[PDB]
Amino acid sequence: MTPEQREFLPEILAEIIANLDPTKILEELLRRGLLTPAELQEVLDLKTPEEQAKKLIDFILKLSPADVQARINVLRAHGYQALADKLNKYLTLE
């Protein structure tokens, strides 16, 4: 249980569901080999919007710091700069 994570993560989630495009990011993720077929079938099977965004935060927060670095560099150059500033700052918040 983490009170600090539950006080900031469920709050930003609302602003990410309406400002995210699973189609545009999925292409750049598979090309670099960052997405697994087992995890892919999980989030791609669900048709729930709330679960999709949750699978995204869980997709980057469950991997190593070297794994997210690739997503942060594409996010800034693809026009999702506002998104790259939110996850990067909270990531180094200890």
Q: What is the dihedral of CA 69, 59, 18, 49, to 10 degrees?
A: 170
Report d(CA 5, CA 87) in Å as an integer: 12
Taking the CB of residue 87, how many other CB atoms lie within 10 A of it?
Answer: 18
Residues 74/28, Cβ–Cβ less than 8 Å: yes
Tell me which residue has tokens 């935060």. Answer: 57
Taking the CB of residue 78, how many other CB atoms lie within 10 A of it?
Answer: 14
Question: What is the domain class of 1-94 according to CATH?
Answer: mainly alpha
Residues 72/34, Cβ–Cβ less than 8 Å: no
**Solved how?**
NMR
